[PDB]
């Protein structure tokens, strides 16, 4: 008994959940009207991709 024989892996597979519920970045950088700098608009971003 000399060595050990192995089957080397061939490909790499990455499976994750389907992409949905993206963070509303399109509502921040693309707005019809912006805000003055003194009254700067602050939006909290959570529970989203």
């Amino acid at each position: 008994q000399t060595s050990n024989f192995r089957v080397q892996p061939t490909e790499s597979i990455v499976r994750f959940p389907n992409i949905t519920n993206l963070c509303p970045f399109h509502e921040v950088f693309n707005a019809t009207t912006f805000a003055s700098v003194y009254a700067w608009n602050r939006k909290r971003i959570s529970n989203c991709v």
Epitope: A35, A39, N41, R42
Partner: nanobody
């Protein structure tokens, strides 16, 4: 989405009286401060007078007696009373709602005086 209803403008002779009114419907979050701006024909935009939510008033022109601000807490509206009207105040007016996060603007009222 906030709608600022403007009403009470038009043609008035010298020394007349009128009552501008801005009603803020929509978001208009609780710590609001309401103000009025003046836009002379082809000139810069200056601030008529501002009223806060604690009834504190800050007039941005030596104009006391001319403008008086009345507050309606039940409907969160602001009325501007105009008296002793003189030709140099002939300008369109917009009301300014700072709210807390995003400030808004009115549509416009034509205030005119001549003789």
């Amino acid at each position: 989405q906030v709608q600022l209803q403007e009403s009470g403008g038009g043609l008035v002779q010298a020394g007349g009286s009128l009552r501008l009114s801005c009603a803020a419907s929509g978001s208009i979050f609780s710590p609001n401060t309401m103000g009025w701006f003046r836009q002379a024909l082809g000139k810069q935009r200056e601030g008529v007078a501002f009223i806060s939510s604690i009834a504190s008033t800050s007039y941005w022109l030596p104009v006391k007696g001319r403008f008086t601000i009345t507050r309606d807490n039940t409907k969160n509206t602001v009325h501007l009373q105009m008296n002793s009207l003189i030709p140099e105040d002939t300008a369109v007016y917009y009301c300014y709602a700072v709210d807390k996060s995003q400030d808004y603007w009115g549509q416009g009222t034509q205030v005119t005086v001549s003789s």
